[PDB]
Amino acid sequence: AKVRIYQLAKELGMETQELLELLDQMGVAYKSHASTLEEKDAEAVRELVKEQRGLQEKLAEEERRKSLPRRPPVVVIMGHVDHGKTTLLDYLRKSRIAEKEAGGITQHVGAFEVKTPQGTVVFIDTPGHEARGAKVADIAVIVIAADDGIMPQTEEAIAHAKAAGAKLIFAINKIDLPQADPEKVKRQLMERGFVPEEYGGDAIVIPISAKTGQGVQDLLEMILLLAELEDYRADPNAEPRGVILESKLDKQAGIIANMLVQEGTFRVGDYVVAGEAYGRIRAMMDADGNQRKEAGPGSAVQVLGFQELPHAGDVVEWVPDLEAAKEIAEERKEERKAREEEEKARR
């Protein structure tokens, strides 16, 4: 003090003409950048530069938080009995560790992930063969055998999947067999109004062999492709929301539930309600057997601590406290009771 303008500028990491512009907006009059500033003013300048810069760092932050991270595609497999669903799932579950040493673990949490350079894909395991619930799968892979073709069962699977909001992918399996005619199946698909992309339609058709592994990598790349196109994303910071895949019992363990996380992040100690089932999460284990402290979108984990058994397809919801988990769970019990005895009246 009293500081010259070119001095203050160097101080603030600023440009002479930057600071001069600022003084004019500020109302402080100078002669040239050589001029001296009253410490009153310089103190104001130092302050304003904090305001403006802090706000810009703030606006940049809110800017990036508008952009939500992606999430892996969740895939279900459908089809007609004998057409190779099971064989395909096993293969996919084989193809993940071509690394032996395990370890480490492979328990079954209801879904598994296949990591590719192009991305990670999540596969529902849990065969129930359907049974409504809450949306689980983004994509359905409809499996068809090339020696058999399209059965009414396949027509059902296709109808179901669309009704469930799934984007369809048609997999033509068993192409190793000499009696296999994939073109026949394509014709059947077109006959039914699904036109493959090679003929200019929007249907996706990948010939594969679950036995040999032919075209399975291509099937994977196509799933990830349609994922980018659909652009699946989720907010890890939202109110945690997920869905129950399967919930079973274990003698020493008790009630366990497999859960897919959809939005948010569940952590240990969170109180959750699923349908009429509530509880506190004691522990969480993934497909790798790792005990997890936190779970974000795309994660299939096994949850310990439910008081009842949650039904599959039921939504898992975060709640602040045990009491809130209890009231919500209880109210859903009331309505179900009442609406049950309402079915006593009308048969």
Ligand X SMILES: Nc1nc2c(ncn2[C@@H]2O[C@H](COP(=O)(O)OP(=O)(O)O)[C@@H](O)[C@H]2O)c(=O)[nH]1
Candidate residues 49, 172, 210, 285; the one interacting with ligand X per rule CB under 6 A: 210
Candidate residues 38, 82, 239, 335; the one interacting with ligand X per rule CB under 6 A: 82
Residue 39 tokens read as 């410490």
Q: What is the DSSP string of 189-211?
A: HHHTT--BGGGTSSB-EEE-BTT
Candidate residues 22, 45, 78, 83; the one interacting with ligand X per rule CB under 6 A: 83
326 lies in the site for ligand X, by CB under 6 A: no
Q: How far is the CB of 88 from ligand X (least distance, A)?
A: 7
Pair 278, 306: CB distance under 8 Å:
yes
79 appears as a binding residue in the annotation: yes
Which among 329, 265, 340, 273 is positioned nearest to 296, based on CA atoms?
265
Candidate residues 73, 84, 240, 305; the one interacting with ligand X per rule CB under 6 A: 84
78 lies in the site for ligand X, by CB under 6 A: no
Residue nearest to ligand X (CB): 84
Provide the mask over 20-59, with x wherever binding to ligand X is found by CB under 6 A and - wherever it is not.
----------------------------------------
174 appears as a binding residue in the annotation: yes
175 appears as a binding residue in the annotation: yes
128 appears as a binding residue in the annotation: yes
311 appears as a binding residue in the annotation: no
Site for ligand X in 122-181 (CB under 6 A): 173-174, 176-177
* Span interacting with ligand X, options 7-15, 77-85, 282-290, 330-338, rule CB under 6 A: 77-85
125 appears as a binding residue in the annotation: yes
Residue closer to ligand X by CB (options 4, 211) is 211
Candidate residues 81, 97, 253, 322; the one interacting with ligand X per rule CB under 6 A: 81
Tell me, rounded to whole angstroms, the distance of Cα 24 from its chain centroid.
52
219 lies in the site for ligand X, by CB under 6 A: no
* 167 contacts: CB under 8 Å, gap ≥ 6: 138, 139, 140, 226, 230
Residue closer to ligand X by CB (options 87, 116) is 87
**For the range 134-137, what are the long-range contacts, defined as Cβ-Cβ under 8 Å and sequence gap of 24 or more?**
134/243, 134/313, 134/314, 134/315, 135/164, 135/165, 135/243, 136/74, 136/76, 136/243, 136/245, 136/260, 136/313, 137/74, 137/75, 137/76, 137/161, 137/164, 137/166
Residue type, 117: P
Residue closer to ligand X by CB (options 87, 118) is 87
Q: How far is the CB of 345 from ligand X (least distance, A)?
A: 43
Which among 67, 78, 115, 101 is positioned nearest to 235, based on CA atoms?
67
83 appears as a binding residue in the annotation: yes
27 appears as a binding residue in the annotation: no
Bond into 2 cis (ω within 30): yes
Pair 220, 114: CB distance under 8 Å:
yes
Number of residues that bind ligand X (CB under 6 A): 15
Q: Which value, in Å, is the radius of gyration of the alpha carbons in the chain?
A: 29
95 lies in the site for ligand X, by CB under 6 A: no
| Widest Cα–Cα separation across the chain | 95
* 322 contacts: CB under 8 Å, gap ≥ 6: 271, 280
82 appears as a binding residue in the annotation: yes
* Span interacting with ligand X, options 34-42, 49-57, 75-83, 238-246, rule CB under 6 A: 75-83
Spatial distance between the Cα atoms of 246 and 73, rounded to a whole number of angstroms:
19
> Annotated binding site for GTP, which residues?
79-86, 125-129, 173-176
Residues that bind ligand X (CB under 6 A): 79, 81-87, 173-174, 176-177, 209-211
